[PDB]
Amino acid sequence: LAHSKMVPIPAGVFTMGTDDPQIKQDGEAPARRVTIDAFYMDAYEVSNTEFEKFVNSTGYLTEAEKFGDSFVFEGMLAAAPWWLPVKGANWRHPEGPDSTILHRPDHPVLHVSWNDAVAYCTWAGKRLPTEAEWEYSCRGGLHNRLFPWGNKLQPKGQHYANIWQGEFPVTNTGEDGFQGTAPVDAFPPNGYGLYNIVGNAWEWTSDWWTVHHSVEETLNPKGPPSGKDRVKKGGSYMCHRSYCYRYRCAARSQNTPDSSASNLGFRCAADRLPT
Ligand SMILES: *[C@@H]1O[C@H](CO)[C@@H](O[C@@H]2O[C@H](CO)[C@@H](O)[C@H](O)[C@H]2NC(C)=O)[C@H](O)[C@H]1NC(C)=O
Ligand SMILES: [Ca+2]
Ligand SMILES: [Ca+2]
């Protein structure tokens, strides 16, 4: 269990975005050439256990605990009728008060806000990645592919990510081996050595959200200087093509920095290795 290990992501130039946006409302277009300096990125989503080390040390009280509620998928018991705001739903109690994390220590932490994530990473001698670092990393050395691994969803007939199978929201067949979340080290790594960069839990980035992008070539871009929503990436175990096709590197979405929910977590990046 090296669930806080990092990988060196190589310096390089890449196509961020796409001239074939499958969800236009989200600012997937235009494709634009971005240059990214070499850095490090968590190989894994931050796990319940890793977060607990953080909380052991600092006594950090997450925002869901402070507000007293968080968003849980009805399916496992508001932005959709299936998102319910549940009292005493937080990272220790992912589906509300009578749920627990004891049987799932290696699964990614949930019900953490952008602030929670930042407190963790900075605690950890790290920081959140920018969207561009995230997306570049997601792509995993490949150019203009849908997914970290290519354009087939199940290559060689194999599940490569934790998402929805079946009729959403009513039936999740769990064909891919998991109905909710999966251990942070489940499924194959992309070419850069990252696990579950699409699927499992959504992932916070450091950028404010905008849908307005130039084709101006940029270098280590931080997104806009302001916003009201922060950028999240890579879909979750609830994604399906039929209604939410965001288990692609190009896809993107947003939340206010103080939101939290049962399919949303994070991982850290860093310019240089921490201790
Ligand atoms: C966070 O702190 C708690 C409490 O100090 C740790 O749990 C204890 O660990 C010791 C040593 O393994 C055991 O003898 C006890 O059985 C535990 N006590 C309790 C209160 O359950 C816990 O391991 C820490 N969590 C993490 C992720 O490091
Ligand atoms: Ca699944
Ligand atoms: Ca993920």
Side-chain angles (χ1 to χ4, degrees), residues 2-275:
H3 291 159
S4 278
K5 87 182 210 154
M6 303 198 73
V7 292
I9 304 289
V13 178
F14 85 106
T15 301
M16 179 161 194
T18 191
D19 290 335
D20 200 355
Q22 306 295 288
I23 303 162
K24 294 159 169 151
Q25 189 180 75
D26 288 331
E28 293 184 8
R32 51 214 182 263
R33 299 287 292 179
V34 187
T35 309
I36 296 295
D37 275 332
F39 76 112
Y40 296 81
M41 179 70 104
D42 287 0
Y44 305 115
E45 290 163 333
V46 167
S47 68
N48 288 310
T49 282
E50 292 311 306
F51 204 74
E52 191 161 289
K53 298 188 190 163
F54 162 57
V55 172
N56 271 16
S57 166
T58 56
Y60 182 70
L61 198 71
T62 59
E63 303 197 83
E65 300 175 61
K66 278 188 277 192
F67 296 123
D69 66 43
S70 203
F71 283 114
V72 185
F73 177 41
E74 161 149 46
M76 303 178 85
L77 285 177
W82 56 79
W83 287 109
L84 294 160
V86 175
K87 273 169 192 153
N90 61 50
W91 80 274
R92 299 185 174 287
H93 298 295
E95 300 85 39
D98 312 318
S99 52
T100 184
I101 62 171
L102 298 179
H103 58 276
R104 45 179 153 176
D106 48 1
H107 277 226
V109 76
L110 301 168
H111 299 294
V112 300
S113 63
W114 184 93
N115 295 320
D116 294 332
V118 173
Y120 183 85
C121 290
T122 49
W123 166 77
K126 302 185 185 191
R127 52 158 168 105
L128 279 169
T130 60
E131 181 181 8
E133 285 168 346
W134 195 98
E135 183 164 316
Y136 179 44
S137 300
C138 185
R139 287 190 186 268
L142 299 192
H143 166 76
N144 289 344
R145 297 322 208 289
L146 287 172
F147 309 125
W149 53 90
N151 309 322
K152 288 287 181 192
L153 179 61
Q154 289 171 81
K156 319 196 108 211
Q158 286 150 20
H159 289 292
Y160 267 56
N162 184 15
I163 63 151
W164 193 277
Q165 283 93 46
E167 193 168 345
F168 185 89
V170 314
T171 290
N172 187 333
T173 65
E175 169 194 343
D176 65 18
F178 307 92
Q179 292 187 291
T181 59
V184 296
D185 61 349
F187 295 103
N190 77 344
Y192 288 161
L194 309 176
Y195 287 81
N196 298 312
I197 191 67
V198 304
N200 219 23
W202 275 98
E203 309 195 2
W204 283 119
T205 68
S206 62
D207 295 44
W208 286 121
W209 163 278
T210 179
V211 290
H212 292 294
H213 312 312
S214 68
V215 288
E216 106 178 22
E217 301 185 329
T218 44
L219 168 71
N220 300 300
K222 308 181 163 15
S226 49
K228 67 190 166 89
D229 292 300
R230 297 280 184 193
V231 181
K232 68 169 171 181
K233 297 284 278 178
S236 83
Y237 67 82
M238 282 164 71
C239 288
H240 201 285
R241 183 75 183 80
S242 71
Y243 95 90
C244 165
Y245 177 31
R246 303 198 168 69
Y247 43 88
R248 290 172 298 118
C249 292
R252 51 206 305 272
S253 203
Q254 81 260 47
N255 267 131
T256 55
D258 69 319
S259 325
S260 61
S262 73
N263 58 349
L264 168 65
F266 65 105
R267 86 176 66 217
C268 313
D271 290 323
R272 286 171 256 84
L273 289 172
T275 68

